[PDB]
């Protein structure tokens, strides 16, 4: 039997995949999750002893971003290993092409938590591999279930793009995505080109300059918004200003209710 319910501060979710919690923990009815340090537990009873013993009130590792009542952490997988085994396998639960759980010292992991009196609360991350050969920019994200579609998937990619920036470098998140992944990519990539289009003449590697979204990223997304024409072997940018305004005015697109500000960004490479 593997774990197939957990608890976490006062949410349980079901789970939507297998993950290789070890064997006597699968066997349990829930899986009882401090919220902050993420420590696993078989019962209700360890679960409330760790509760009222636990010092933590928010995630290891630096906040790197504070804009009202979201945080944003970074975890380095070699300072913080068992955290950051427990994210992983925490994660598998709802990735079901996540392959790394206890080989996590290459990766670096953002934490995106929303605060309150009690504390920073976890609503989702990403991780990032510290060193890509693919150029990924991203290895896995993920919004936990009870937060999903309200924008704060859609900040998590925002902010991978805004590190990219930072590094003047181009990414791509590590694929295949999960179909709310593919959906909030392309609404993001979407939204960020057609904001930019409004503001004469520039070309898909200008775009890609300036977004740090990779060409083909680029590409793809101005073909479904068809501003984009083919010419003999070549990608051409095809804009219409005034059909770049009428698919802002439109519903598909949209200011995410909650957006990544470079100012409350403490970050460098
Ligand atoms: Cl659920
Ligand atoms: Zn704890």
């Not at 070699?78 to 950051?84: A, E, M, R, V, W």
């Not at 609360?121 to 279930?145: M, Q, R, W």
Request: proline share 6%.
């Amino acid at each position: 039997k593997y774990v197939d319910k957990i608890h976490i501060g006062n949410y349980e979710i079901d789970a939507w995949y297998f993950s290789p919690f070890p064997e006597d923990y699968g066997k349990q009815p829930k899986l009882w999750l401090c919220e902050y340090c993420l420590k696993y537990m078989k019962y209700e009873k360890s679960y409330r002893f760790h509760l009222g013993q636990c010092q933590w009130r928010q995630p290891p590792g630096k906040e790197i971003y504070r804009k009202s009542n979201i945080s944003v952490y970074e975890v380095d997988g070699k300072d913080h290993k068992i955290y950051c085994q427990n994210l992983c396998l925490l994660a598998k639960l709802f990735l079901d092409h996540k392959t790394l759980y206890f080989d996590v010292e290459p990766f670096v992991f953002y934490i995106l938590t929303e605060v309150d009196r009690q504390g920073a609360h976890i609503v989702g991350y990403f991780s990032k591999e510290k060193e890509s050969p693919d150029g990924n920019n991203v290895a896995c994200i993920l919004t936990l279930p009870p937060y999903q579609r309200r924008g704060y998937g859609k900040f998590l990619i925002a902010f991978s793009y805004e590190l990219s920036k930072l590094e003047s470098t181009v990414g791509s998140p590590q694929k295949p995505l999960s179909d709310l992944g593919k959906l909030s990519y392309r609404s993001y990539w979407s939204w960020v080109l057609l904001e930019i289009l409004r503001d004469g003449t520039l070309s898909i590697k200008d775009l890609s300059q300036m977004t740090s979204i990779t060409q083909n990223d680029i590409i793809s997304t101005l073909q479904s918004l068809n501003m984009v024409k083919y010419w003999k072997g070549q990608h051409v940018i095809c804009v219409t200003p005034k059909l770049v305004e009428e698919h802002l005015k439109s519903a598909q697109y949209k200011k995410p209710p909650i957006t990544v500000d470079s100012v409350c960004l403490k970050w460098a490479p």
